[PDB]
Amino acid sequence: SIDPEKLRDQLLDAFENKQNELKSSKAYYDAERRPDAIGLAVPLDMRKYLAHVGYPRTYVDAIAERQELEGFRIPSANGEEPESGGENDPASELWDWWQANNLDIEATLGHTDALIYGTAYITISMPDPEVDFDVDPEVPLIRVEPPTALYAEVDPRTRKVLYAIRAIYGADGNEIVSATLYLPDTTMTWLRAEGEWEAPTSTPHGLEMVPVIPISNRTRLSDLYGTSEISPELRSVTDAAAQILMNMQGTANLMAIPQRLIFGAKPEELGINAETGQRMFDAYMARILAFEGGEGAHAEQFSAAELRNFVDALDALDRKAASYSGLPPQYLSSSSDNPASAEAIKAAESRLVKKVERKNKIFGGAWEQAMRLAYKMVKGGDIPTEYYRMETVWRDPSTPTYAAKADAAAKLFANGAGLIPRERGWVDMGYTIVEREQMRQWLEQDQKQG
Amino acid sequence: SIDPEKLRDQLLDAFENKQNELKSSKAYYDAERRPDAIGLAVPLDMRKYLAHVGYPRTYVDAIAERQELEGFRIPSANGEEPESGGENDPASELWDWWQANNLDIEATLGHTDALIYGTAYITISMPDPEVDFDVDPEVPLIRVEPPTALYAEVDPRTRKVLYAIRAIYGADGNEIVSATLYLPDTTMTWLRAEGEWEAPTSTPHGLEMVPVIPISNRTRLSDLYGTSEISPELRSVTDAAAQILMNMQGTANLMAIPQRLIFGAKPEELGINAETGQRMFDAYMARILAFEGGEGAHAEQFSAAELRNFVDALDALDRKAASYSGLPPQYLSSSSDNPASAEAIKAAESRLVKKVERKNKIFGGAWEQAMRLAYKMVKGGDIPTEYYRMETVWRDPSTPTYAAKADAAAKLFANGAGLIPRERGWVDMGYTIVEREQMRQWLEQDQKQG
């Protein structure tokens, strides 16, 4: 074993060296200045006019805008018809803790950092009402923290955190305000660190496991720790398009206009004020310049650069940015048409929808594990074995066409004589767990009227 | 512990220091003059003719105008029915305070500043008879204040507000008229600052917490304080398009015309007046000029500049501004096409609706907390456990499309024989929480009469 007072410092050194890596994908999402984005043809004084490109934000927030959790699901042990418990159902307690924590806000934020940096960390604890307020003391704290703060060391052999270090800098400083260490049997906090480390508070717990769960953006089994969603090809297209926009904007200032020359003109004959090298003339529209010069003298011009030559490359990179991201082509305007029918919409969104179903599946695993730790921490003892087979139920990622499903559900449920039971029609209409449990009240009240 | 006067000083300095940041986002929404917007080809006297670009205002307005609070939902006691009650039961009590304050106006404004600056503050208080207020005396006086008038300090360790201050400025001389300081113990005010402060008034609170709740535009967990909705790529495309409009408008004054020339002339041959360098000729239509010529004299032109060379760049930037903001393409006129059907509308708005539903959760969290402090301030004691599981309910951000839902809802209800209870059809039609209660009474009058 290792002494916590020294273990925290190797964890803070490991955490601080990770900040140097994940500063990279931040620069694409926030659209910070990058050397590779600067358009090489633009003169060195005009290179201050950066041209930031929004594809990484547009992809990452399109994957995050359409994830929502409807509730949890747990099998009955030897019974059947599980939802008949209602407010007594084992799944309704886990959803009650999800609501009491505001996880429908905290998780939809954390699913954004999990895509930007490739990982984010759920944490579990009991509230301490000596110091914490605006929280119900009966239910566990579940809190999600980004990899720019909480850091964790993961076992190469099995999916476990060995230990993790939580807390943060303050007042926009470089200096740490406080640190917290998680260990398989205790949590320790150094309540201040600004002048020097103040002596730690400590709180033991019976989990035999670290109360930190990584939401990790894995794609292969080969991804041990998850990876940023902003893939190398989408970075390369973002930087490629930023150079084209900047070179086009340089050209629109310096060269989108023909340059006018006269040869065989003596400057002292044209009347150039030689102390300044230039001559004013009145340039109202229909004036004719008559020149006295004739010694082979003539006017000629350099042609304008056509800005359309760069736009033909901007359009080509918009076909690449759409193709690699799998967004509908109308998200980036890579085609003129939007779809115009409930089937054609489902066709265009299909790859975005299947990418989001893959994310709902992967992040659902972390929420199962976090809810099992929250149960073990609150209820004590050990897990009722049905919770190892729990599931997460997520909202349909596709655009909600209402009328196209309302006709279909009404054809299938032909006034009770049809193909499906009433309750199955409600889940095909997409009414969430809490909405169906409320409709079971209104349907019973309507059955009193006839 | 801390002196309120030294704290007032130290955080009026922090409030004033923040204003130098906020002006960098105000300048894009108000369309103030910016160095980066001035197109470089335009001559230095013509650079007064600024072109201003409306993408930042268009995006922030389109997000702010679609969101509206429909009511508060508080979970019931045992029996799982949050529609149960009336007569000041929880959902109607909190909505009565919302309506009695006109927060349907104050929040519609405050969400705009929360998107422009990245934050705005909700202030909770009791009213008093000594100020000339026209307000209901037992309603909690809830107001919203911009970061240009209120500032607050947030605890990095657990995201509570530690402290806040208002500073209020006179229109003449731009100097402070009064300031108000918020602490968990009390609110204090210095009603004058003319030459120097008065001695402060003070009013204690039964809260354990500062009665100031930040609304913040939280983009992700690693964004601690919320950030301006006018992202760096939408700034970049706004300034890029302003430079093209400047240079195009310069070119429409200089060079949209072919400049015409003559070579091999002499002054006294054309009759040029030697005192002025000019020669009027009566230039009505179809007349022919005849010249002495000699010396190989001939007439020739510089070309006009083709103005569509800039319009091809204006169109390209109108595709990028639509791509980065996620507005429908017809909002910026990035194409002439328009959605012909209720499904085609859901396709075009798919990005904008989900971006507004993302804001409804993030700003909903602040309105839950503000109503929870207001209850604890009015009723005293401590909060009933159900208010920790409260949620805000919001209007659907989609354009209404009534007749497309009307027969979908009618075909699901099927005159009471169908798939859904009557009360659910009213929710899917989008009737608001207060508005459904009117129908729930007219239905009883119709049932009694018919």
Q: Which alpha helices (DSSP H) does A30-72 contain, by range?
A: 55-64
Provide φ and ψ at A151, rounded to 5°.
-125, 145
Q: In angstroms, what separates the C-alpha of B128 from chain A's closest C-alpha?
A: 26
CB distance B210 to B164 below 8 Å: yes
Which of A61, A349, A402, A445 to mutate to test binding with chain B, by most B CBs within 10 Å of its CB? A402
Mutate to test the interface with A, among B218, B219, B350, B426 (most CBs of A within 10 A): B350
Alpha-carbon gap, residue A312 to A79, rounded angstroms: 65
Q: Do B261 and A133 touch (CB under 8 A)?
A: no
* Residue spans of beta strands (DSSP E) within A115-165: 119-125, 141-145, 151-154, 161-165
Of B233, B265, B302, the CB nearest to A291: B265
Tokens read off for A273: 């004020």
Cβ neighbour number for residue A169 with a 10 Å cutoff = 16
Report the candidate in A67, A14, A264 with the shortest Cα–Cα distance to residue B296: A264
Residue with tokens 């009145």: A282
Residues B223 and B230: beta-carbon distance below 8 Å: no
What is the distance between the alpha carbons of residues B199 and B415, in angstroms, rounded to a whole number? Answer: 70
Q: Give SS3 for A276.
A: coil
- Please check whether residue A146 is in contact with residue B221, taking contact to mean a CB–CB distance below 8 angstroms: yes
Q: Which two tokens stand for residue B430?
A: 């989008």
How many whole angstroms from its chain centre is CA B251?
A: 34
Chain B residues inside the 8 Å CB shell of A102: 365, 368
Chain B positions touching A108 (Cβ under 8 A) are 358, 361
At residue B47, the 3 state secondary structure works out as: helix
CA distance A60 to chain B (A): 11
Beta carbons within 8 Å of B320's beta carbon, 6+ residues apart: A54, A245, B237
**C-alpha to C-alpha distance for A331 and B349, rounded to whole angstroms:** 10
Residue A308 C-alpha, separation from nearest chain B C-alpha, in angstroms: 6
Structure-token pair, residue A10: 């190797």
The Cβ-side half-sphere exposure at A57, using a 13 Å CA radius, reads 22
Instruction: Give the CA-trace dihedral at B194, B200, B201, B202, to 10 degrees.
Output: 140
| Smallest Cα distance from A150 to chain B, Å | 11
Strand order in the sheet with B141-145: B141-145, B119-125, B212-216
As a residue count, chain B comes to 450
Q: What is the DSSP string of B221-287?
A: TT-SS---SS-HHHHHHHHHHHHHHHHHHHHHHTTSSPPEEEES--HHHHT-BTTTTB------TT-
Size of interface A-B (CB pairs under 8 A): 310
From B45's Cα to the closest Cα of chain A, the distance in A is 13
The one-letter code for the residue type at B110 is: G
Q: Identity (one letter) of the amino acid at A48?
A: K
* Chain B positions in Cβ-Cβ contact with residue A285 (cut-off 8 Å): 257
Record: contact A146-B416, CB cut-off 8 A = no
Contact A372, A90 (CB under 8 A): no
* Orientation of helix B308-325 relative to helix B232-253, angle to 10°: 160
Q: B157–A138: do the CB atoms touch at under 8 Å? A: no
Contact yes or no for A168 and B156 at CB 8 A: yes
Q: Give chain B positions within 8 Å (CB) of A298.
A: 263, 300
Residue B335 distance to chain A (closest CA, Å): 7
**Measured distance CA(B384)–CA(B375) in Å, rounded:** 10
- Alpha-carbon distance A350 to B444, whole Å? 46
Chain A residue nearest residue B344, CA to CA: A340
Torsion over CA: B29, B221, B74, A364 (sign): positive
Q: Which residues of chain A are within 8 Å of residue B422 when distances are taken between CB atoms?
A: 442, 446
Chain A CB contacts of B337 under 8 Å are 336-338
Nearest neighbour of B310 by CB, restricted to A177, A252, A429 = A252
Nearest to A250 by CA among B252, B52, B41, B251: B41
Contact B316 A248 (CB under 8 A): yes
* Cα gap A95→A71, rounded to integer Å: 6
Q: How far is B171 from chain A (nearest CA, A)?
A: 32
Kindly list the residues from chain A whose CB atom is less than 8 angstroms away from the CB atom of residue B419: 409-410, 413, 422, 425-426, 429
Question: Method of determination?
Answer: cryo-EM
Contact between A303 and B275 under an 8 Å Cβ cutoff? The reply is no
- To 10 degrees, what angle do helices B308-325 and B55-64 make? 30
CB atoms within 10 A of CB A308: 15
Residue A396's CB is within 10 A of a number of other CB atoms, namely 14
Distance (Å) of CA A421 to CA A418, A441, B132, B356? 8, 17, 62, 35
A113: closest chain B residue by CA? B220
Give dist(CA B142, CA B122) in Å, integer.
7
Alpha carbon of B286 to those of B199, B282, B283, B345: distances in Å?
86, 11, 9, 56
How far apart, in whole angstroms, are the C-alpha atoms of residue B86 and residue B93? 9
- CB–CB of A407 and B404 under 8 A? no
- Count of CA atoms in the C-beta half-sphere (13 A) of B183: 17
Hey, what are A5's tokens?
Answer: 């007072």
Residue B365: list chain A partners with CB under 8 A. 102, 105
- Is B418's CB within 8 Å of A410's CB? yes
Paired tokens of B370:
């503000």
Record the tokens describing residue A414, joined without a space. 């032909």
The C-alpha R_g of chain A, in whole angstroms, comes to 32
The label of the residue with tokens 């984010």 reads A120
Nearest beta carbon to residue A298 from set B41, B263, B348: B263
Q: Which residues contact B77 (CB under 8 A, 6 or more apart)?
A: B386
Between β-strands A151-154 and A288-290, what pairing exists: parallel, antiparallel or unpaired?
unpaired
Pairing label, strands A288-290, B260-263: parallel
Burial tier of B306 (Cβ tally within 10 Å: 0-12, 13-18, 19+): middle
Q: Do A162 and A181 touch, CB atoms closer than 8 A?
A: no
Residue position matching structure tokens 């992967």: A362
**To the nearest whole angstrom, how far is the Cα of A238 from the nearest Cα of chain B?**
12
Q: Is the dihedral of CA B407, B408, B409, B414 positive or negative?
A: positive
Mutate to test the interface with B, among A89, A257, A325 (most CBs of B within 10 A): A257
**A177, A189 Cβ separation under 8 angstroms:** no
Identify all chain B residues contacting A257, using CB atoms and an 8 Å cutoff. Answer: 41, 247, 251, 255, 305
Phi then psi dihedrals of residue B180, to 5 deg: -135, 130
Burial code (b: 16+ CB inside 10 Å, e: under 16) for B343-357 equals bbbbbbbbbbbbbbb
Distance CA B106, CA B143 (A): 7
Asked if the Cβ–Cβ distance from B303 to A298 is below 8 Å, we say: no
By C-alpha distance, the chain B residue nearest A421 is B419
- Other residues' Cβ atoms within 10 Å of the Cβ of residue A174: 5
Q: Which residues of B touch A287 (CB under 8 A)?
A: 260
